[PDB]
Amino acid sequence: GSNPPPPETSNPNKPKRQTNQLQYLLRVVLKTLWKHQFAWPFQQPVDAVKLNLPDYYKIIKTPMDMGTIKKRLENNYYWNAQECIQDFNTMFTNCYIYNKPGDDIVLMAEALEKLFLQKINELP
Ligand SMILES: COc1ccc(Br)cc1S(=O)(=O)Nc1cc2c(C)noc2cc1O
Ligand code: NA
**Is ligand 1 within 6 A of the CB of residue 45?**
no
Q: What is the DSSP string of the chain?
A: --PPPPPPS--TTS-----HHHHHIIIIIIHHHHHSGGGGGGSS---TTTTT-TTHHHH-SS---HHHHHHHHHTT--SSHHHHHHHHHHHHHHHHHHS-TT-HHHHHHHHHHHHHHHHHHT--
**Is ligand 1 within 6 A of the CB of residue 99?**
yes
Starting from the CA of residue 106, give the closest ligand. Answer: 1
Which structural technique was applied? Answer: X-ray
Ligand 2 centroid to residue 93 C-alpha, Å: 9
Starting from the CA of residue 53, give the closest ligand. Answer: 1
**Is ligand 1 within 6 A of the CB of residue 47?**
no
Ligand 2 centroid to residue 105 C-alpha, Å: 11
Show me where the domains of the chain are located: 19-123
In whole angstroms, what is the distance from residue 113 CA to residue 119 CA? 10
- What is the separation of C-alpha 66 from the centre of its chain, rounded to a whole number of angstroms? 4
Question: In CATH, which of 1.10.340.70, 1.20.920.10, 3.40.1190.20, 1.10.1740.110 is domain 19-123?
Answer: 1.20.920.10
**How far, CA to CA in Å, does 12 sit from each of 9, 33, 77, 78?**
10, 28, 9, 12
Q: What is the DSSP string of 57-76?
A: HHH-SS---HHHHHHHHHTT
Ligand 2 centroid to residue 10 C-alpha, Å: 30
